[PDB]
Design a protein around this ligand. Structure first.
Ligand SMILES: Cc1cc2nc3c(=O)[nH]c(=O)nc-3n(C[C@H](O)[C@H](O)[C@H](O)COP(=O)(O)O)c2cc1C
Ligand code: SF4
Ligand code: SF4
Ligand code: SF4
Ligand code: SF4
Ligand code: FES
Ligand code: FES
Ligand SMILES: [Zn+2]
Lengths: 142, 60, 235, 114, 49, 108, 99, 162, 430
């Protein structure tokens, strides 16, 4: 822990990170991969998708890793069953209004949504209502 | 089917929840032959048998 | 039964399109300067909502594309920000609006005391329906959420978009039975100004309640009757 | 049996060029390449099946989400040269047209089970 | 070259290989393959199947 | 002419002046149309079939499209926005090509 | 069912064994027919088995599972196994190694 | 990065217990029995970079990744179109072997394999990926900092105005 | 104030005195009622003294949180690091059951301004903004006139009220959004962007309006603070129970003989409040299906609980509800609870800003399911699914509007599951 570097615990393993990292940054340093949709390294942090939720012993409710600053001696749990359930619920909310356009989508083999549905989601749905519909508009030749 | 309105894969996920533990065995510690042959029958009456498993595991 | 705006994108119309030009009048521009003075110079975008309200009042109740572009130019911001804010909030109307905008609250506390029947009487007498302007153009009907008038639950709110910034009023009419609502709207058609606030009582005193089509006057225990305590200091 | 591409009752091909049938093909008998059509639809500019490489497993009929590709009830399709056994989109569409009613009846019956 | 061909196919794509290994008894041949995949996958078969 | 024209979309399920996604198939042979690449005859194309079918009026701002009449014997369920749609400019089902339009947004 | 056994080992003994094996298989078939249960024929898990067609056509998660099972396939956990079955010709086994 | 704690444990343990006998470079290639002109082909040892479409880190060299990620790939050769059916035809025997099956955990392992068979190789290290946010948007708080337009000027205050 | 029994507040103990607008609400009447009395002295006594007196009074925060006002005010920075401090008064009163703040704004404008001065001095805030609902045009005009009058007599500005303190007050108004009542979303709206809440791990005391330390407090807390400093913290503490000391403005609405807004000490029995001030429930106390105690966000309570329930924070917490705002809504036996809770679900579907996935999608899902239950279209398992969805939303959202959307539905499931089952079965039966 030389000066700026601190120590954080991710899933019970010691990781030395600078003070300016967030929870997601330390989790990446620990080799743990958190599900993300809106967080991007080179873009401003948003925190809207709420798919990165992890558990901090200090915090009562799950926090978003991308926007949560890491602290000295913080213990981070990314595999607790509550986090698994929260991941599945967020995935359900993401998919309830999604169009059934996988065969006609050009993201078919490269979709984050599908892959994280398979890995961090349930295999079945309970939604029977009408989905939302949007009308597309031209953004240019490309 | 009780899975229609109750969706939880992490509770029903057996594929990714298997693990391997580690032990070390040494020749110095003697083997327990009491376990192997103490439970072995000495007379026809004491013979105990393991029945064939009727069905393979199913979720129900 | 959707309200005035069904589109979250710009719908080209002969009234509303790119060539249309909107600018603040000189007196309205003085009001613009006074509005801006309240917020720091560097953070000038803080005035977007008051300026959009002022432009709406001037333009007769419609926030057009020219209005948004003019406000964006004055605030030195990308137009998409003004588009986003004009689309987010409810009071901003981006479609043509009538002389009067009559709004009926349909939230729970109003629905218990009879907001449904109020709306039914209003839509019968006016004859158009929620989200639809009168064929004359005198009233545009709308449903809004809680208006802060729950004790006087059966209530409507009307906006005067005729005169402009000088003569715009957003008034509340409360404790109203369907016949009272019809009477208020007829008075509005004539141009006569109805009783501000609740009809049967002054404000949220313990004076009675609206049950069905009638006001049941019950007066029991009152609290602030008497002489008010006045100045006091601890020693 | 013999493969056949199908059309909607309007006459528009059911194929949407998802290319799943080519990914699931155990024998790699299907080659597909597509484009955007002028109207704007996702349609194939090429759909050829090698019937000398097909194993008639029926996996492609299983993977198709729109019932575009089906294995028809025809087993009389021997040829005198191997080139005639390299089918293409036009030939498969013609085979679908020829056997449309039988395929539709078989699919209606099969839908109950799966 | 069946064994090497299996290595280039997915698990479900390689089932038809076992049917053609023995043309007299197809079901028994594919059965062992599906049982091994089930053991590794920890998948439980319903009683009707 | 077609050899130096920019590939464009008519705009039934697209916009009138967009680029068309194109592969290089038929570029050597000299074919520049979608149907020419795969059909060598002079018969009626499936696009000609789908154009002949007329747009259908519906009530509401969203229509559920299953492609066929029976949900499990056609395209996946799709919800299409009917806002800003008319007979001349109808909404399109991407799987089937059926055209829909509604007057409800105009408060009717 | 009962195992058929002979002792000589000659060609005739194996022929007799095979005939009796046919009879034992008939007995097993009759038991299967009478005791055939009702319910699912494939595993309920849709991360290893394809969804039904109406289900893929009505649910987003089922379309995703169908697409990823008919393009990529399921991922089998790292391990090795040898599973053998009593084939008619003898013991047929597969030694499968997964990474 | 912690541990897989699965069959890979015994896999690595079998690796560290056992070892291979040293031979001169290229000698095994003769034992292989393949055409000797195969080893005239040149080898590139590289790790694929992340696809820009996806944000997963599995394919990259990351502590999350526990799979072999270093490929031996051979140079691309001539490809043509079938005159009858327009299929892509080739004469390269080694077209897909390296991409499909030649996967190694470490660059030295692939280099050892190439030197053992006699393939000349060039190792290309992946461009380093460092997950460092810029100072302007180092954290969520920085989004709503005074950095956007400076500290608010208070010359608009009525007391300061008058 | 007696520990055994609470209720029957006297006129001498009421802070809000022209709440009913029988007198001049402007400066002439305000001075005669005790407003702006000795503000020079209270402000000159220093920020520390005000903070300790507020802490001793036990004043918890009106507006829903219930968080202690003194501790929140003490979180403000003491010394400037180059960044000014701001006071923002949350006069946005969007809440389906609450009408209480509007009377204060329209009939006691000067108490709010004096409270803003006192609290800004307590937190060392140079400038203050009074956020008002855009719909409250006339109330805003009243508040603006009060501000102008206070400026005219020197109560505000440099050397405000004669003490060596400087405070400038502005009145800002929104364009209509329930979310803009949230602390961060209000700050974003006043900055000039969409009123979308900011993730809390950065806290408003650290970085707020224009990136500077800010505190958002309700009109009622700001208004009650000056008289607390005048009358005395002990007087404020006497009325309520332990940890719950002060008087609070109760707005009784719904099926009551007289709907009233009234001031009462906390820890009054709900039955006592409804029967004495509201005139009793329409058709008698016997005619009660349910009562929503704290506005629409909090779960409803059935009649049985309403018998012994006491109008307090912690007790309503024990009764699996809350006193967010003293907005008590009464429903008759005639009322269809399913339809009212469905209307609240529609409210929350309309008021979600859409920023985070769980609120934006699950609130519309909840509205759809509640709409189907209002007709009996759903199955019996749909209720359990509804509980599961409410659990999915709670805790996984940026702000508390997801929680406020989940709670009424959970209360309906918890206390009135029998009626939903009845409606579902009968529709199938008939
Ligand atoms: C969705 C939502 C809406 C809110 N609306 C209001 C409101 O209209 N008025 C209010 O005073 N507080 C409202 N709040 C509570 C805010 O946190 C408020 O600014 C704060 O609690 C005031 O703190 P106080 O209790 O110390 O006065 C709302 C909170 C949320 C999550
Ligand atoms: S491929 Fe991905 S983005 Fe496209 S429709 Fe399927 S899930 Fe949605
Ligand atoms: S039946 Fe099987 S081998 Fe033949 S084309 Fe279809 S998927 Fe390919
Ligand atoms: S035939 Fe079916 S599976 Fe094959 S590309 Fe067409 S739609 Fe896809
Ligand atoms: S909970 Fe709802 S209102 Fe709050 S930030 Fe999320 S989407 Fe917006
Ligand atoms: S990655 Fe979306 S909330 Fe953090
Ligand atoms: S619910 Fe209508 S004004 Fe409050
Ligand atoms: Zn369709």
């Amino acid at each position: 822990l030389p000066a700026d570097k601190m120590e954080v615990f991710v899933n019970g393993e010691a990781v030395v990170v600078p003070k300016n990292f967030t929870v997601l940054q330390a989790c990446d340093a620990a080799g743990v991969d958190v599900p993300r949709f809106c967080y991007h390294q080179r873009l401003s942090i948003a925190g809207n998708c709420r798919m990165c939720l992890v558990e901090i012993e200090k915090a009562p409710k799950p926090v978003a890793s991308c926007a949560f600053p890491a602290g000295p001696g913080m213990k981070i749990k990314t595999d607790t069953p509550v986090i698994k359930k929260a991941r599945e619920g967020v995935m359900e909310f993401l998919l309830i209004n999604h169009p059934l356009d996988c065969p006609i989508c050009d993201q078919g083999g490269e979709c984050d949504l599908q892959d994280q549905a398979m890995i961090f989601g349930s295999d079945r749905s309970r939604f029977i209502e009408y989905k939302r519909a949007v009308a597309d508009k031209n953004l240019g030749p490309l | 089917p009780k899975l229609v309105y109750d969706i939880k894969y992490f509770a029903r996920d057996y594929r990714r929840n298997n693990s391997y533990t580690v032990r070390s065995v040494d020749s110095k510690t003697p083997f327990d032959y009491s376990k192997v042959f103490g439970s072995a029958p000495l007379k026809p009456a004491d013979v105990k048998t393991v029945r064939i498993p009727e069905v393979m595991p199913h979720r129900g | 039964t959707n309200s005035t705006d069904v589109f979250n994108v710009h719908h080209d119309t002969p009234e509303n399109n790119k060539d249309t030009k909107f600018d603040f009048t000189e007196a309205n521009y003085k009001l613009v300067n006074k509005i801006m003075s309240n917020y720091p110079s560097n953070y000038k975008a803080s005035a977007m909502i008051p300026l959009l309200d002022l432009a709406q009042q001037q333009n007769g109740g419609v926030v057009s594309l020219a209005v948004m572009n003019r406000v964006a130019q004055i605030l030195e911001v990308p137009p998409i920000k003004v588009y986003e804010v004009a689309t987010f909030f409810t009071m901003f109307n981006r479609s043509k609006m009538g002389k009067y905008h009559v709004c009926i609250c349909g939230t729970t506390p109003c629905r218990l005391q009879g907001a449904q029947k109020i709306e039914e009487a209003i839509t019968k007498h006016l004859g158009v329906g929620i989200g639809q302007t009168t064929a004359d153009g005198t009233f545009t009907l709308g449903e809004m959420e809680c208006m802060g008038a729950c004790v006087n639950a059966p209530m409507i709110a009307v906006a005067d978009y005729r005169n402009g910034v000088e003569g715009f009023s957003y008034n509340y009419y409360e404790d109203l039975t369907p016949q009272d609502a019809v009477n208020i709207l007829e008075k509005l058609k004539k141009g006569e100004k109805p009783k501000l606030g609740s009809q049967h009582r002054q404000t949220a005193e313990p004076a009675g309640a609206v049950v069905g089509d009638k006001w049941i006057p019950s007066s029991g225990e009152q609290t602030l009757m008497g002489e008010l305590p006045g100045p006091y200091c601890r020693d | 049996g013999e493969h056949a591409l199908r059309r909607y009752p309007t006459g528009e091909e059911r194929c949407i060029s998802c290319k799943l049938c080519e990914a699931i093909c155990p024998a790699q008998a299907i080659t597909i390449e597509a484009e955007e059509r002028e109207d704007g639809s996702r349609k194939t500019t090429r759909y050829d099946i090698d019937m000398t490489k097909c194993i008639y497993c029926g996996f492609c009929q299983e993977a198709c989400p729109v019932d575009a590709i089906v294995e028809g009830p025809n087993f009389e399709f021997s040829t005198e040269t191997r080139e005639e056994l390299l089918y293409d989109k036009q030939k498969l569409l013609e085979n679908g047209d020829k056997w449309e009613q039988e395929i539709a009846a078989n699919l209606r019956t099969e839908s109950l089970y799966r | 070259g069946t064994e090497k061909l299996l290595e280039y196919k997915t698990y479900n794509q390689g089932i038809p290989y076992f049917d053609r290994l023995d043309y007299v008894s197809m079901m028994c041949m594919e059965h062992s393959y599906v049982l091994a995949i089930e053991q590794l996958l920890n998948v439980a078969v319903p009683l009707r199947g | 002419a077609e050899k130096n024209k920019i590939p464009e979309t008519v705009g039934g399920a697209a916009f009138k002046g967009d680029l068309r996604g194109t592969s290089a198939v038929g570029l050597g042979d000299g074919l520049y149309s979608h149907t020419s690449k795969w059909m060598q005859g002079n018969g009626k194309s499936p696009m000609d079939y789908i154009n002949e079918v007329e747009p259908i009026k519906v009530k509401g701002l969203v229509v559920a499209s299953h492609g066929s009449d029976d949900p499990a014997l056609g395209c996946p369920v799709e919800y299409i926005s009917l806002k800003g749609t008319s007979y001349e400019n109808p909404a399109v089902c991407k799987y089937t090509g059926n055209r829909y339009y509604s007057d409800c947004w105009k408060h009717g | 069912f009962n195992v058929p056994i002979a002792g000589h080992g000659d060609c005739y003994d194996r022929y007799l064994v095979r005939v009796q094996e046919m009879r034992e298989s008939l007995r097993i078939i009759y038991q299967c027919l009478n005791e055939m249960p009702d319910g699912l024929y494939k595993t309920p898990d849709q991360k290893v088995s394809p969804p039904s067609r109406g289900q893929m056509k009505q649910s987003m998660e089922s379309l995703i599972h169908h697409f990823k099972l008919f393009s990529e396939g399921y991922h089998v956990p790292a391990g090795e196994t040898y599973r053998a079955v009593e084939a008619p010709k003898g013991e047929f086994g597969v030694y499968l190694v997964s990474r | 990065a912690t541990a897989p704690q699965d069959f890979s444990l015994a896999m690595k343990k079998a690796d560290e217990i056992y070892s291979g006998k040293t031979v001169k470079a290229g000698d095994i290639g003769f034992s292989a029995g393949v055409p000797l002109e195969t080893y005239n082909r040149k080898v590139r040892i590289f790790c694929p970079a992340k696809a820009a479409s996806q944000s997963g880190l599995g394919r990259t060299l990351h502590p999350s990744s526990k799979a072999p990620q270093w490929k031996i790939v051979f140079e691309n050769l001539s490809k043509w179109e079938n005159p009858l059916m327009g299929w892509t035809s080739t004469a390269d025997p080694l077209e897909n072997v390296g991409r499909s099956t030649l996967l190694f955990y470490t660059k030295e392992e692939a280099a050892a394999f190439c030197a053992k068979h006699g393939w000349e190789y060039v190792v290309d290290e992946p461009n380093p990926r460092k997950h460092i946010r810029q100072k302007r948007y180092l954290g969520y708080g920085d989004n709503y900092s005074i950095k956007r337009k400076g500290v608010p000027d208070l010359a608009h205050l009525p007391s300061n105005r008058s | 104030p007696e520990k055994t029994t609470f209720g029957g507040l006297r006129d001498q103990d009421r802070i809000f005195t022209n709440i009913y607008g029988r007198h001049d609400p402007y400066i002439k009447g305000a001075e005669a009622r005790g407003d702006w009395y000795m503000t020079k002295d209270l402000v000159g006594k220093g920020r520390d003294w005000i903070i300790d007196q507020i802490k001793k009074s036990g004043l918890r925060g009106r507006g829903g949180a219930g968080f202690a006002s003194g501790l929140k005010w003490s979180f403000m920075p003491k010394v400037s690091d180059g960044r000014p401090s701001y006071l923002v008064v949350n006069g946005d009163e969007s809440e389906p059951g609450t009408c209480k703040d509007r009377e204060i704004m329209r009939h006691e404008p000067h108490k709010l301004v004096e409270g803003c001065l006192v609290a800004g001095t307590a937190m060392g805030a140079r400038a203050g903004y009074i956020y008002i609902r855009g719909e409250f045009v006339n109330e805003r005009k009243a508040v603006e006139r009060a501000v102008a009058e206070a400026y005219a007599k020197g109560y505000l500005g440099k050397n405000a009220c004669g003490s060596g303190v400087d405070f400038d007050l502005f009145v800002h108004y929104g364009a209509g959004a329930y979310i803009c009542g949230e602390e961060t979303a209000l700050i974003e709206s006043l900055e000039g962007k969409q009123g979308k809440p900011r993730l809390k791990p950065p806290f408003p005391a650290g970085m707020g309006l224009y990136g500077c330390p800010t505190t958002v407090t309700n009109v009622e807390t700001v208004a009650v603070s000056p008289t607390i400093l005048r009358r005395g913290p002990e007087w404020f503490s006497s009325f309520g129970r332990k940890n719950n000391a002060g008087t609070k403005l109760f707005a009784i609405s719904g099926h009551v003989n007289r709907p009233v807004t009234v001031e009462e000490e906390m820890s009054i029995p709900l039955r006592e409040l409804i029967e004495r001030h509201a005139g009793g429930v329409r058709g008698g106390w016997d005619n009660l299906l349910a009562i929503i105690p704290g506005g629409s966000s909090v779960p409803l309570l059935p009649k049985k609980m309403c018998d012994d329930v006491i109008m307090d924070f912690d007790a309503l917490r024990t009764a699996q509800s809350g006193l967010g705002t003293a907005a008590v809504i009464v429903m008759n036996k005639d009322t269809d609870v399913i339809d009212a809770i469905a209307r609240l679900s529609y409210f929350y579907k309309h008021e979600s800003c859409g920023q985070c996935t769980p609120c934006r999608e699950g609130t519309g899902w909840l509205y759809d399911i509640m709409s189907r239950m209002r007709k009996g279209d759903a199955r019996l398992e749909e209720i359990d699914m509804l509980w599961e969805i409410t659990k999915q939303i709670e805790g996984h959202t940026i702000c508390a509007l997801g929680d406020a959307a989940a709670w009424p539905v959970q209360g309906l499931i918890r206390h009135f599951r029998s009626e939903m089952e009845d409606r579902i079965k009968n529709a199938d039966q008939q």
